[PDB]
Design an enzyme around this catalytic site. Structure first.
Site, PDB file in Angstrom:
ATOM      1  N   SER A   1       7.365  -2.927  70.966  1.00 24.09           N
ATOM      2  CA  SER A   1       6.581  -1.925  71.678  1.00 24.09           C
ATOM      3  C   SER A   1       7.378  -0.745  72.191  1.00 24.09           C
ATOM      4  CB  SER A   1       5.808  -2.553  72.848  1.00 24.09           C
ATOM      5  OG  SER A   1       4.823  -3.450  72.380  1.00 24.09           O
TER       6      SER A   1
ATOM      7  N   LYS B   1       6.156   2.555  70.927  1.00 25.25           N
ATOM      8  CA  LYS B   1       4.993   3.220  71.497  1.00 25.25           C
ATOM      9  C   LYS B   1       5.367   4.566  72.107  1.00 25.25           C
ATOM     10  CE  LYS B   1       2.270  -0.986  71.900  1.00 25.25           C
ATOM     11  NZ  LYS B   1       2.284  -2.363  72.456  1.00 25.25           N
TER      12      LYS B   1
ATOM     13  N   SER C   1       1.316  -1.304  77.553  1.00 28.25           N
ATOM     14  CA  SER C   1       1.664  -1.781  76.220  1.00 28.25           C
ATOM     15  C   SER C   1       0.435  -2.160  75.403  1.00 28.25           C
ATOM     16  CB  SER C   1       2.672  -2.925  76.273  1.00 28.25           C
ATOM     17  OG  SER C   1       3.538  -2.795  75.157  1.00 28.25           O
TER      18      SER C   1
ATOM     19  N   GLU D   1       0.044  -2.166  64.806  1.00 27.00           N
ATOM     20  CA  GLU D   1      -0.023  -3.374  65.619  1.00 27.00           C
ATOM     21  C   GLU D   1      -1.019  -4.338  65.013  1.00 27.00           C
ATOM     22  OE1 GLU D   1       1.917  -3.980  67.937  1.00 27.00           O
ATOM     23  OE2 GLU D   1       2.563  -2.044  68.815  1.00 27.00           O
TER      24      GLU D   1
ATOM     25  N   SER E   1       8.544  -6.532  73.154  1.00 32.04           N
ATOM     26  CA  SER E   1       8.878  -7.888  72.785  1.00 32.04           C
ATOM     27  C   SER E   1       8.190  -8.246  71.479  1.00 32.04           C
ATOM     28  CB  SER E   1       8.527  -8.865  73.881  1.00 32.04           C
ATOM     29  OG  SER E   1       7.148  -8.905  74.051  1.00 32.04           O
TER      30      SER E   1
HETATM   31  B1  LIG Z   1       5.008  -4.846  72.799  1.00 34.94           B
HETATM   32  O1  LIG Z   1       5.063  -4.835  74.265  1.00 34.94           O
HETATM   33  O2  LIG Z   1       6.246  -5.291  72.165  1.00 34.94           O
HETATM   34  C1  LIG Z   1       3.825  -5.748  72.314  1.00 34.94           C
HETATM   35  C2  LIG Z   1       3.582  -6.429  71.147  1.00 34.94           C
HETATM   36  C3  LIG Z   1       2.557  -7.292  71.016  1.00 34.94           C
HETATM   37  C4  LIG Z   1       1.808  -7.383  72.189  1.00 34.94           C
HETATM   38  C5  LIG Z   1       0.706  -8.200  72.299  1.00 34.94           C
HETATM   39  C6  LIG Z   1       0.337  -8.958  71.221  1.00 34.94           C
HETATM   40  C7  LIG Z   1       1.060  -8.892  70.070  1.00 34.94           C
HETATM   41  C8  LIG Z   1       2.158  -8.075  69.928  1.00 34.94           C
HETATM   42  S1  LIG Z   1       2.548  -6.296  73.320  1.00 34.94           S
END
Ligand SMILES: *[B]([O])([O])C1=[C]C2=C([C]=[C][C]=[C]2)S1
Length: 261
Positions: A43, A46, A103, A139, A210
């Site tokens: 993320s 983003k 996120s 995503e 993450s």
């Molecule tokens: B990011 O904060 O790295 C995110 C990635 C995912 C999230 C929720 C569900 C699946 C992947 S938040």
């Protein structure tokens, strides 16, 4: 132990691969640890998508308030803000805010779709002089974070340089730069990551990420009370697919590299 020795030891105990790039904007000095190695952004990507829309908004005064329809079918694996707006609309600004501060994955996908796909986010990064960043997927699949997979990766140094350019430097017009900083400062997801390794009263803007392989990332701009800003990228990933995420490692790395400031 030197800062380098401390980072090497942290990585040794951690059971993974650590990447750090700190830029001290007082003198452009840097602290680098695997800073030219690729990591899955998760993320943290983003930021680039939101910034690409901010760039467009510099020449289109109606863009940020443009309505985007949120449909049940748009929802993916994580939609804390967008789920509240199903059957309604969110503006592009609201989608930027949701993507960065919560996120939200639906928000990220709407930004990417608006821009014309992951390759357009890559082109935006290249326009900023970032030759390293690549966005390949939407995503949620951009978070697979498979070791050695180049998709949806960058290096700690490339991302630190670009985050500096975006938030403190030449990438965005002033109003847009300020908006990005406002968004990052209002992040809700980063308490236990870089922020937890810093003095509590330092002002911070950050974006966490993450993914699989216990991939645990944070990118931050840090404003000390009596010093010039620091830009810090802490990326971390592990060998096993279902590894737990490790924000504590990011906090520990932040503490190591900001000692003295
Ligand atoms: B990011 O904060 O790295 C995110 C990635 C995912 C999230 C929720 C569900 C699946 C992947 S938040």
């Amino acid at each position: 132990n030197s800062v380098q020795q401390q980072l090497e030891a942290l990585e040794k105990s951690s059971g993974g691969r650590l990447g750090v790039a700190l830029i001290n904007t007082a003198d452009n000095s840097q602290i680098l640890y695997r800073a030219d190695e690729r990591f899955a952004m998760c993320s943290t990507s983003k930021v680039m998508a939101a910034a690409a829309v901010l760039k467009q908004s510099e020449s289109d005064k109606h863009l940020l308030n443009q309505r985007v329809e949120i449909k049940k079918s748009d929802l993916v694996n994580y939609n804390p803000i967008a789920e509240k707006h199903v059957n309604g609309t969110m503006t592009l600004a609201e989608l930027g805010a949701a993507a960065l501060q919560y996120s939200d994955n639906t928000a990220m996908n709407k930004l990417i779709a608006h821009l014309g796909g992951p390759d357009k986010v890559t082109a935006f990064a290249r326009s900023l002089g970032d030759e390293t960043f690549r966005l390949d997927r939407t995503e949620p699949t951009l978070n697979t974070a498979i070791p050695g997979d180049p998709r949806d990766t960058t290096t700690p140094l490339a991302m630190a340089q670009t985050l500096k350019n975006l938030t403190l430097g030449k990438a965005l017009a002033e109003t847009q730069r300020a908006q990005l900083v406002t968004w990052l400062k209002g992040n809700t997801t980063g308490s236990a990551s870089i922020r937890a390794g810093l003095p509590k009263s330092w002002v911070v803007g950050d974006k966490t990420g993450s993914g699989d392989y216990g991939t645990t990332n944070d990118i931050a701009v840090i404003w000390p009370e009596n010093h010039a800003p620091l830009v810090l990228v802490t990326y971390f990933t592990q060998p096993e697919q279902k590894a737990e995420n490790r924000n504590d490692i990011l906090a520990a790395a932040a503490k190591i590299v900001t000692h003295g400031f």
